[PDB]
Design a protein around this ligand. Sequence first.
Ligand SMILES: NC(=O)c1ccc[n+]([C@@H]2O[C@H](COP(=O)([O-])OP(=O)(O)OC[C@H]3O[C@@H](n4cnc5c(N)ncnc54)[C@H](OP(=O)(O)O)[C@@H]3O)[C@@H](O)[C@H]2O)c1
Ligand SMILES: CCc1nc(N)nc(N)c1C#CCc1cc(OC)cc(-c2ccncc2)c1
Ligand code: NI
Length: 165
Amino acid sequence: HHHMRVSFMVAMDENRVIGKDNNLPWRLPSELQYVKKTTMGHPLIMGRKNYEAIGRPLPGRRNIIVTRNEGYHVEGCEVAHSVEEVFELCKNEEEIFIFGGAQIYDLFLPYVDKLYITKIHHAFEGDTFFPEMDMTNWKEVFVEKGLTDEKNPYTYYYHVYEKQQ
Ligand SMILES: NC(=O)c1ccc[n+]([C@@H]2O[C@H](COP(=O)([O-])OP(=O)(O)OC[C@H]3O[C@@H](n4cnc5c(N)ncnc54)[C@H](OP(=O)(O)O)[C@@H]3O)[C@@H](O)[C@H]2O)c1
Ligand SMILES: CCc1nc(N)nc(N)c1C#CCc1cc(OC)cc(-c2ccncc2)c1
Ligand code: NI
């Protein structure tokens, strides 16, 4: 029914941890640069909790916040209250990025066409997890090692998977 490409944008560790105490468990400025590079000029779909942790609209992108709160408003952001409302707001977009967190990844999981997933080779303490996925009829179309240096202290890889079906 929907004609935009629904892409997940996520970074997780070896046990699918994405968050700890409503924040990121790691700092990888280089990984964040990849995110900015890949998401330039495309809508970001964010769970209300994800957005409020970020704290500000991200520039050069439509910021869409998913909440059940019908009175929720943020300057410089758009507000949606369901998957279908997001689809209406984005009906003419080429590609949208589901930017997290876990509740929002769960929400859009039946509709995901493309997965941009960074895998971090470390086991962090965490409380928030990326959902399990069946990768039947998906294919890895890109893989590259991330930059590990004094400012990026973990090993990690960028992966891109595309749904065939
Ligand atoms: N590593 C990564 O790639 C990454 C990415 C993003 C986030 N994170 C982390 O993940 C954590 C946040 O994830 P989270 O799951 O706790 O929160 P979240 O998914 O970002 O947002 C949860 C909120 O989304 C709204 N929501 C949930 N289901 C909805 C529905 N069916 N319809 C309309 N609105 C709905 C609700 O807002 P209301 O309560 O206002 O109704 C809910 O409280 C943080 O630790 C964050 O740092 C990590
Ligand atoms: C950067 C990891 C990340 N990597 C990947 N591959 N996908 C993601 N969805 C996220 C993520 C996230 C959630 C997130 C939380 C946050 O503070 C708590 C700040 C940002 C952010 C800071 C500066 N420019 C833009 C965004 C993003
Ligand atoms: Ni180095």
